[PDB]
């Protein structure tokens, strides 16, 4: 029973998925110079969309990014078909395949517009990437992650719009809000929030620092167990 | 007197009443008055190219009902 | 000969250089004009990453060719 030296994952264990990518794929530096990703300060950094994506360690093992492998300072790479930042089609066609992006310095949740989508973003030492759809081989690992992303958006957007709202009103708003089809869920429950109570609070805290005395926030945190 | 849309990366749509002679900085300033977003954080893209603040909508052939894509330089820690 | 350098921001840099100069010298020629250390520079031509130990004559880089510059961010 031997683990991976990088992601501490058992090699003998089934359900362990090794990443797969087309031979067409190229390294990260070569993609950023592709004219189809050009939209034309040095402090300003490139930002593209990346669909059909998959995250993996140096040994090729598909890895989750919740587990704390990034906080543990394990170098996590990722792959997919890069697209211009303004495209909405999550289909791989029209996008340029890429291999071994990264490593991931930081992953962040964007988009608190009130719009339909929640935005996931990867920061590399060369460019920024707004993720779209996970590859059909990486969907099971990204499934649990997708709820945390959207639940955090629901909370942050509802707090910004209703700063004096209660914790009971927050459960209603979450439960009333219809989950997108990408989540493959029929409805949100109070369990959907209690499962990631530590995560939601840490997201709202980071949102306030970028630019938490609300009673619902409090009531939540005391009943959150965190 | 023209109606144009501005679409964010989350899918949110903002409707603006502009003139074909108005500049991109006027569009950014209009976005600030409606969604409260500072213009310095704003980047506008049309037909796959980022619009320069010094040019007008007639220069980029931004016709009525054209959709502008708004990308934002996010503040993060 | 004059050679251009296209940045990801769309900025174009005009450099005068000899085919005998190396990519490490090509990056050294870029620093003086814009103030970017060579370690942060990544040079791409025709979809191929220019290694430091070679010259422009090595990659058949004729006159009036356009190199594409990618920058590695300061930290991480």
């Amino acid at each position: 029973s031997p683990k991976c030296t990088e992601c501490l994952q058992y090699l003998d264990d089934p359900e362990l998925r090794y990443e797969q990518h087309p031979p067409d794929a190229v390294e990260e530096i070569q993609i950023l110079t592709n004219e189809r990703l050009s939209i034309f300060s040095y402090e300003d950094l490139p930002q593209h969309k990346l669909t059909c994506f998959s995250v993996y360690c140096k040994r090729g093992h598909l890895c989750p990014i919740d587990t704390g492998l990034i906080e543990k300072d394990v170098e996590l790479l990722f792959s997919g078909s890069a697209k211009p930042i303004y495209e909405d089609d999550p289909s791989p066609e029209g996008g340029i395949n890429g291999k071994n992006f990264g490593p991931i310095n930081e992953w962040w949740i964007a988009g608190f517009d009130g719009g339909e989508k929640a935005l996931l973003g990867f920061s590399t030492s060369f460019a920024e990437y707004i993720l779209m759809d996970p590859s059909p081989e990486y969907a099971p690992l990204f499934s649990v992650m997708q709820e945390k992303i959207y639940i955090s958006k629901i909370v942050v957007e509802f707090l910004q719009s209703n700063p004096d709202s209660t914790y009971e009103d927050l459960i209603n708003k979450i439960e009333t809000t219809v989950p997108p089809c990408m989540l493959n869920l029929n409805r949100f429950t109070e369990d959907s929030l209690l499962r990631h109570a530590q995560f939601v609070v840490e997201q709202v805290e980071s949102y306030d620092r970028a630019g938490f005395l609300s009673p619902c926030m409090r009531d939540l945190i005391k009943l959150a167990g965190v | 007197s023209m109606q144009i849309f501005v679409k964010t990366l989350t899918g949110k749509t903002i409707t603006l009443e502009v003139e074909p002679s108005d500049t991109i900085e006027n569009v950014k300033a209009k976005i600030q008055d409606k969604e409260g977003i500072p213009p310095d954080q704003q980047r506008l893209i049309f037909a796959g190219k980022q619009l320069e603040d010094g040019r007008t909508l007639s220069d980029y052939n931004i016709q009525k009902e054209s959709t502008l894509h708004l990308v934002l330089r996010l503040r993060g820690c | 000969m004059q050679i251009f350098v296209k940045t990801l921001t769309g900025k174009t840099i005009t450099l005068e250089v000899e085919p005998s100069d190396t990519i490490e010298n090509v990056k050294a020629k870029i620093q003086d004009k814009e103030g970017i250390p060579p370690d942060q520079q990544r040079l791409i031509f025709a979809g191929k990453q220019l290694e430091d130990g070679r010259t422009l004559s090595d990659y058949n880089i004729q006159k009036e060719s356009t190199l594409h510059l990618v920058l590695r961010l300061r930290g991480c």
């Binding site: 991931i104 310095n105 930081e106 949740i109 964007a110 980071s206 970028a210 | 934002l72 503040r75 | 991480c76």
Partner: peptide
Amino acid sequence: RTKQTARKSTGGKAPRCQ
């Protein structure tokens, strides 16, 4: 008229980044 900045929340960050 109030003005609201565009923001993102930090989900994870490598220790080497400081």
